[PDB]
């Protein structure tokens, strides 16, 4: 298991524009296109992202390419963020994956806001952080995915994904 496989399980793969759990236009492997309520606006963001007139449909290769870019950006965002970096540096490889997953789903800003949980992870208080992470809109809105990520931070293994 690795970050790519992990996220492919959590996000799935769709080659036509779809709406995510929050109702936002998305495509591929969880690639958010726009928060705007307009399909046209989504189609336009899509074309600009792919570099061709797509008509809301992409190939598997194109989906994976957006995916590689998105994981790279998530890592880079973590490394550039003053609150996230130190946490990431302190963690083992498996738990780092869980932090990347959260950033991919919610953005750097979103994750950076889990101040208390972050401090707990940095201190390696696994059970405490898992409880704190669960007291969030994130857990309440997407509980199964949240539980998978939390179990990962709690155990340091891939058990939730196997
Ligand atoms: Cl893009
Ligand atoms: Cl979920």
UniProtKB/Swiss-Prot annotation:
Name of the protein described by the UniProt record: Endolysin
Residue numbers annotated as active site: 11, 20
Keyword Endoplasmic reticulum: no
Catalytic reactions on record: Hydrolysis of (1->4)-beta-linkages between N-acetylmuramic acid and N-acetyl-D-glucosamine residues in a peptidoglycan and between N-acetyl-D-glucosamine residues in chitodextrins
Gene Ontology annotations of biological process type: cell wall macromolecule catabolic process; defense response to bacterium; peptidoglycan catabolic process; viral release from host cell by cytolysis
Enzyme Commission number: 3.2.1.17
Impact upon substituting residue 11 to Q: Complete loss of activity
UniProt xrefs under HAMAP family: ENDOLYSIN_T4
InterPro entries, alphabetized: Endolysin_T4_type, Glyco_hydro_24, Lysozyme-like_dom_sf, Lysozyme_dom_sf, Phage_lysozyme-like, T4-type_lysozyme
Gene coding for it: E
Entry's Gene Ontology cellular component terms: host cell cytoplasm
Record annotation: effect of changing residue 117 to F: 10-fold decrease in enzymatic activity
Keywords recorded for this protein, A-Z: Antimicrobial, Bacteriolytic enzyme, Cytolysis, Glycosidase, Host cell lysis by virus, Host cytoplasm, Hydrolase, Viral release from host cell
Effect of residue 117 to I: 500-fold decrease in enzymatic activity
